[PDB]
Design a protein around this motif. Structure first.
Motif, PDB file in Angstrom:
ATOM      1  N   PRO A   7       0.705  -1.249   0.031  1.00 23.62           N
ATOM      2  CA  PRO A   7       0.014  -0.001   0.019  1.00 23.62           C
ATOM      3  C   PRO A   7       0.654   1.171   0.149  1.00 23.62           C
ATOM      4  O   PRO A   7       1.843   1.304   0.590  1.00 23.62           O
ATOM      5  CB  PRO A   7      -0.708  -0.169   1.276  1.00 23.62           C
ATOM      6  N   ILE A   8       0.263   2.397  -0.592  1.00 27.17           N
ATOM      7  CA  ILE A   8       0.775   3.622  -0.431  1.00 27.17           C
ATOM      8  C   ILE A   8       0.383   4.668   0.784  1.00 27.17           C
ATOM      9  O   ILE A   8       0.712   5.628   0.873  1.00 27.17           O
ATOM     10  CB  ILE A   8       0.657   4.219  -1.655  1.00 27.17           C
ATOM     11  N   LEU A   9      -0.196   3.887   1.500  1.00 30.26           N
ATOM     12  CA  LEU A   9      -0.623   4.586   2.782  1.00 30.26           C
ATOM     13  C   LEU A   9       0.413   4.919   3.505  1.00 30.26           C
ATOM     14  O   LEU A   9       1.415   4.260   3.769  1.00 30.26           O
ATOM     15  CB  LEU A   9      -1.776   3.880   3.604  1.00 30.26           C
ATOM     16  N   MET A  14      -2.642   4.256   8.847  1.00 30.10           N
ATOM     17  CA  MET A  14      -2.853   2.812   9.086  1.00 30.10           C
ATOM     18  C   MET A  14      -2.884   2.721  10.429  1.00 30.10           C
ATOM     19  O   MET A  14      -2.694   3.333  11.277  1.00 30.10           O
ATOM     20  CB  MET A  14      -2.068   2.091   8.290  1.00 30.10           C
ATOM     21  N   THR A  15      -3.092   1.279  10.747  1.00 34.76           N
ATOM     22  CA  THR A  15      -3.698   1.046  12.015  1.00 34.76           C
ATOM     23  C   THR A  15      -2.731  -0.317  12.348  1.00 34.76           C
ATOM     24  O   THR A  15      -2.254  -1.037  11.531  1.00 34.76           O
ATOM     25  CB  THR A  15      -5.061   0.340  11.897  1.00 34.76           C
ATOM     26  N   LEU A  55      -9.011 -10.363   9.383  1.00 36.33           N
ATOM     27  CA  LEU A  55      -8.987  -9.089   8.686  1.00 36.33           C
ATOM     28  C   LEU A  55      -9.492  -7.765   9.408  1.00 36.33           C
ATOM     29  O   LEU A  55      -9.369  -6.862   8.433  1.00 36.33           O
ATOM     30  CB  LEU A  55      -9.534  -9.389   7.325  1.00 36.33           C
ATOM     31  N   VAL A  56     -10.307  -8.108  10.347  1.00 34.33           N
ATOM     32  CA  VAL A  56     -11.338  -7.049  10.804  1.00 34.33           C
ATOM     33  C   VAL A  56     -10.585  -6.287  11.956  1.00 34.33           C
ATOM     34  O   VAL A  56     -10.532  -6.886  12.841  1.00 34.33           O
ATOM     35  CB  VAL A  56     -12.580  -7.590  11.200  1.00 34.33           C
ATOM     36  N   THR A  57     -10.316  -4.939  11.538  1.00 31.26           N
ATOM     37  CA  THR A  57      -9.472  -4.421  12.547  1.00 31.26           C
ATOM     38  C   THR A  57     -10.139  -4.198  13.894  1.00 31.26           C
ATOM     39  O   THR A  57      -9.396  -4.347  14.958  1.00 31.26           O
ATOM     40  CB  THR A  57      -9.340  -2.778  12.264  1.00 31.26           C
ATOM     41  N   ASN A  59     -11.879  -6.383  15.589  1.00 33.25           N
ATOM     42  CA  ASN A  59     -11.843  -7.742  16.031  1.00 33.25           C
ATOM     43  C   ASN A  59     -10.376  -7.985  16.544  1.00 33.25           C
ATOM     44  O   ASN A  59     -10.331  -9.177  17.245  1.00 33.25           O
ATOM     45  CB  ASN A  59     -12.167  -8.679  15.142  1.00 33.25           C
ATOM     46  N   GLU A 235      -3.436  -2.587   7.186  1.00 37.79           N
ATOM     47  CA  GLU A 235      -3.770  -2.505   5.854  1.00 37.79           C
ATOM     48  C   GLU A 235      -2.874  -3.258   4.896  1.00 37.79           C
ATOM     49  O   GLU A 235      -3.502  -3.536   3.972  1.00 37.79           O
ATOM     50  CB  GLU A 235      -3.577  -0.984   5.712  1.00 37.79           C
ATOM     51  N   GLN A 238      -4.344  -6.901   4.850  1.00 36.02           N
ATOM     52  CA  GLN A 238      -5.516  -6.732   3.779  1.00 36.02           C
ATOM     53  C   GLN A 238      -5.194  -6.681   2.361  1.00 36.02           C
ATOM     54  O   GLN A 238      -5.865  -7.223   1.454  1.00 36.02           O
ATOM     55  CB  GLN A 238      -6.471  -5.634   4.357  1.00 36.02           C
ATOM     56  N   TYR A 241      -3.682 -10.192   1.330  1.00 34.12           N
ATOM     57  CA  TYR A 241      -4.766 -10.947   1.316  1.00 34.12           C
ATOM     58  C   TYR A 241      -5.616 -11.051   0.107  1.00 34.12           C
ATOM     59  O   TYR A 241      -5.795 -11.918  -0.495  1.00 34.12           O
ATOM     60  CB  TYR A 241      -5.498 -10.953   2.488  1.00 34.12           C
ATOM     61  N   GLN A 242      -5.443  -9.756  -0.413  1.00 34.16           N
ATOM     62  CA  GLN A 242      -6.634  -9.456  -1.710  1.00 34.16           C
ATOM     63  C   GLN A 242      -5.689  -9.757  -2.806  1.00 34.16           C
ATOM     64  O   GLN A 242      -5.955 -10.443  -3.931  1.00 34.16           O
ATOM     65  CB  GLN A 242      -7.089  -8.282  -1.706  1.00 34.16           C
TER      66      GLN A 242
END
Lengths: 309, 308
Positions: A7-9, A14-15, A55-57, A59, A235, A238, A241-242
């Motif tokens: 990612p470029i975030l 991000m988290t 995948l759910v932040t 959680n 992120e 995620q 994963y995709q």
């Protein structure tokens, strides 16, 4: 061969993947004395989730299930929390996982909110009854046995906890006294070894250290500037994963870039098993701009010689 | 890198209006409601709108400093000077409704107020900390985040210092005054809101908005409270990074079962960042847990969707 990418975030976008927190800085240090084997925030570069990673932040370090009784009352109420998978499905202890997905992966006293929504509605009421209360899930307790299907959750003097569907929202640590972010809990309790683990991570090339994404974690009380480190941001998990982009070698060369100036700031190795190493000795600050992010350059090998960060 | 949406299942993403897993898809008539949320707003080209930002745990969070009590005579109420999530001072003249991530609904938001002192005492190994249950009431006359402050209420009446403070949202105090579609007055009573993401409504006959619905915890009271977002947070993060040009005002997307390969239904994904479907009423949306949307083609406002 689908091109690999990250990612470029920015880190400010991000988290943390080991606790639901913003990321505050990059951090590195020697870890020769330490076994770095977290179980949340673990993913291969081809997108295979490892350990207890999901995948759910919200959680991450959450627990879901129901309360069924208690052992310990009065001064400190200690409830029997039967834990399920986050998707609501019954947890099967013979699943090939260390514990239910999202289970905390460190020794500590996790502070949060226990919430309940009753399974039925009283005649004439606008819906089911609810209650939420401060609670602590101690992952060092002999009753912390999530792999066996239950943990103990404590509410101090609050006695108003029902045998009803229950969720635990993590907020931070009760205090720093017994927190060790790199010690794994015993997911099946005392005298039984953990299984299904994401592998431990460590630099194999002389002069390299792990690069961490660091978040400050709140404390209910006590002295300290407590933090928790993840190997890659949620992120990124995620993203891989995709994408499921094939790993062409065991090591991706990534470079941290300032998109405003276009300047490449430093280079790092991103490993197949989902962690980053950098050429640096010691724990001094990593001075990078807020707008910076990593960019995949090329596939290399474990012997690639990084420029000093 | 033409336009695309993530392939994550709803069981794999997060509500963009409150940090929650997504429990179901949901649709209903909204002709008597104004749907104008300010979090979870992003154009298909990746322009964040309203108070929307990218960090999931910053949705409905507040960061800043406590500076004494709010007014006088109530030691439960504290003056919370709010700041931007990145630490910068908030400029009230910026063209946004309020600091990024500010709650975008009327309600009593329950959570935890945490403090870490800015200095370490000699003789201690780190700064002092305290955390306490707290409520941020977005209907209060002192809820003025656009002006730089909110009132935060605690049950604790003394153990709160004039120190750096963050609010972690958890749920609602109760459902009594919750209305997820009524915006707060970000500048308090008698001042209008500004910099708003536009309201959304189906313009084509026979269509309804499609929502991603999450159950939101309650500290007490009776109800099955939920909150609906227009797109998941992961979609916002996706569009923001991709910045794909929008070829028309409407992307046709189709929900697919990746195991059977079968296309389940079709929907319009509008340039302003929301979905409509051809359905009347609020009956259940019967789809498999593994389903996800896939971009098909750019169409326009005239396209006639198959009945969902």
């Amino acid at each position: 061969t689908k091109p690999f990418s990250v990612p470029i975030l920015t880190i400010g976008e991000m988290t943390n993947s080991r606790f639901p927190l913003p990321i505050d800085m990059l951090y590195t240090s020697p870890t020769e004395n330490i076994v770095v084997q977290p179980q949340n925030g673990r993913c291969t570069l081809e997108g295979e989730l490892l350990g207890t990673t999901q995948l759910v932040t919200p959680n991450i370090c959450a627990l879901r299930g129901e309360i069924r009784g208690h052992e310990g009352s009065g001064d400190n109420h200690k409830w029997h929390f039967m834990v399920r998978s986050p998707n609501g499905a019954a947890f099967d202890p013979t699943e090939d996982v260390p514990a239910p997905l999202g289970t905390p992966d460190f020794i500590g006293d996790v502070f949060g909110v226990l919430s309940q929504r009753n399974r039925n509605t009283d005649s004439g009421q606008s819906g089911p009854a609810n209650r939420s209360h401060d609670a602590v899930v101690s992952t060092r307790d002999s009753r912390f046995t999530p792999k066996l299907g239950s943990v103990m959750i404590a509410t101090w003097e609050t006695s108003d906890i029902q045998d009803q569907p229950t969720r635990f929202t993590p907020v931070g640590l009760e205090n720093p006294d017994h927190y060790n972010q790199w010690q794994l809990p015993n997911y099946s309790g005392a005298l039984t070894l953990n299984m299904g683990l994401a592998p431990s991570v460590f630099p194999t090339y002389p002069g390299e250290q792990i690069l961490f994404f660091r978040s400050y974690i709140p404390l209910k009380g006590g002295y300290g500037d407590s933090h928790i480190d993840c190997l890659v941001p949620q992120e990124w998990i995620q993203h891989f994963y995709q994408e499921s982009a094939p790993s062409q070698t065991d090591v991706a060369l990534i470079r941290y870039v300032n998109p405003e100036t276009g300047r490449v700031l430093f280079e790092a190795k991103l490993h197949r098993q989902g962690y980053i190493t950098v050429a640096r000795s010691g724990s001094s600050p990593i001075n990078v701009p807020a707008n910076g992010y990593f960019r995949f350059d090329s596939w290399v090998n474990q012997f690639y010689s990084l420029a000093p960060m």
